[PDB]
């Protein structure tokens, strides 16, 4: 049995960034040749692990996580880096191997008048931990005094949305994202390429 | 992750000149470094870099053969010789580095990033 | 050669200043990003922007950037006598087979 790819790159609908998805792969054969023979990605880099080893090599577990972001984002995601995704949204280790992987949406994820329903968090107390995720839209606060659920200066609603109209500049435009992770240990290998 | 540099010269004209850096509090091995620099009063320039692990250096098309670049895994550090001296050589020369490691694309050869999120204290080198 | 850039620039207090940065069919044209630095005297230079428009985390919020055409450009917003400093963009040149800088920007406050 080969690997269930097609649910991870071929779904309808992807993840908010602030409440990104994660799939696990285990118990078959993984077809790596799919992916990286593939014209249909604008970005594809792998950390730790050349893409043509893939197919020889073999893990304990595999991971897919799944979300939409703008087009200058994509540079946020990778090892090392900081900013408002890196920081509040989506963490990567530094110990990652594994591979980042992404496209142009801009037919499927915007929309005329703007697609608000995909959102980033632009606020929080601290940041993240590698591969930390929360969904409690809590009022930040800095104010002089507590904010108890009301908005207003320093009392600010934690999310924003994108508003992805169909004609804006390709920096603009909408991305999805594919991170793969490889997880190898002393329990027995669940994943292989094909040979 | 912090950069430490050497110390600054004084040469007369078809001498050469060392300078070096090393890397703390963190890997040095996986990361590219990047050697700049900048004349009185003029604007940067990209001499070389080089990745420790592949050990062989990529060089600006100016500054090849008079230029050499060198690393090692056991110390953290680099180093750079620069060769038959002329007084327009006079100049801060700087270390710098990338903020994530080297990657593979879907070719399998390795890359790195043209960002320099990190930059060492610089070495004045003067010729008379 | 390198990328095209103004000696100068200047503005009031609590004012936008913007610099601009142009390339040719090389670099900048063959979409590779820009990246934009800041210079105080006697001191190395410190990254702002990277990415055409991805601010560091630690940067001010009044620096904004972007790229279109054979160009990008810095955006100084709420102008202080702090932000007085040399400014230098940087992009990839497939036909140098590296990096290449600008010739720099020294801003200067009005008073």
């Known amino acids: 049995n080969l690997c269930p790819f097609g649910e991870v790159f071929n779904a309808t609908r992807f993840a908010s960034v602030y409440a990104w998805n994660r799939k696990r792969i285990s118990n078959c054969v993984a077809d790596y040749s799919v992916l990286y023979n593939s014209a249909s990605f604008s970005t594809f880099k792998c950390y730790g692990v050349s893409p043509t080893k893939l197919n020889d090599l073999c893990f304990t577990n595999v991971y897919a996580d799944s979300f939409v972001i703008r087009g200058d984002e994509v540079r946020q995601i990778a090892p090392g880096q900081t900013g408002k995704i890196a920081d509040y949204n989506y963490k990567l280790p530094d110990d990652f191997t594994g591979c980042v992987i992404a496209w142009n949406s801009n037919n499927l994820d915007s929309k005329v008048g703007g697609n608000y329903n995909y959102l980033y968090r632009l606020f929080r107390k601290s940041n993240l931990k590698p591969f930390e995720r929360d969904i409690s839209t809590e009022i930040y606060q800095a104010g002089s005094t507590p904010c108890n659920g009301v908005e207003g200066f320093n009392c600010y609603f934690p999310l924003q949305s994108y508003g992805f109209q169909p004609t804006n500049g390709v920096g603009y435009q909408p991305y999805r994202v594919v991170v793969l992770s490889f997880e190898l240990l002393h329990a027995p290998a669940t994943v292989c390429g094909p040979d | 992750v912090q950069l430490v540099q050497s110390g600054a010269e004084v040469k007369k004209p078809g001498s050469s000149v060392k300078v070096s850096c090393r890397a703390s509090?963190?890997?040095?091995?996986?990361?590219?470094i990047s050697w700049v620099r900048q004349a009185p009063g003029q604007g940067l320039e990209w001499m070389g870099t080089i990745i420790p692990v592949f050990g062989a250096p990529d060089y600006a098309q100016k500054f090849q053969g008079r230029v050499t670049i060198t690393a090692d895994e056991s110390t953290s550090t680099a180093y750079m010789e620069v060769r038959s001296l002329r007084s327009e050589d006079t100049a801060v020369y700087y270390c710098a580095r990338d903020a994530s490691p080297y990657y593979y694309d879907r070719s399998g050869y390795p890359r790195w990033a043209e960002d320099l999120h990190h930059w060492g204290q610089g070495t004045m080198v003067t010729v008379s | 050669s390198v990328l095209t850039q103004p000696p100068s620039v200047s503005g009031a207090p609590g004012q936008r200043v913007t610099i601009s940065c142009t390339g040719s069919s090389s670099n900048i044209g063959a979409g590779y990003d820009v990246h934009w630095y800041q210079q105080l005297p006697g001191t190395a230079p410190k990254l702002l922007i990277y990415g055409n428009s991805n601010r560091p985390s630690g940067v001010p919020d009044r620096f904004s950037g972007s790229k279109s055409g054979t160009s990008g450009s810095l955006a100084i917003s709420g102008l202080q006598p702090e932000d007085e400093a040399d400014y230098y963009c940087?992009?990839?040149?497939?036909?140098?087979?590296?990096?290449?800088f600008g010739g720099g920007t020294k801003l200067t406050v009005l008073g």
């Open positions: 509090g963190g890997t040095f091995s996986s990361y590219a």
């Open positions: 940087q992009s990839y040149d497939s036909s140098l087979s590296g990096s290449i």
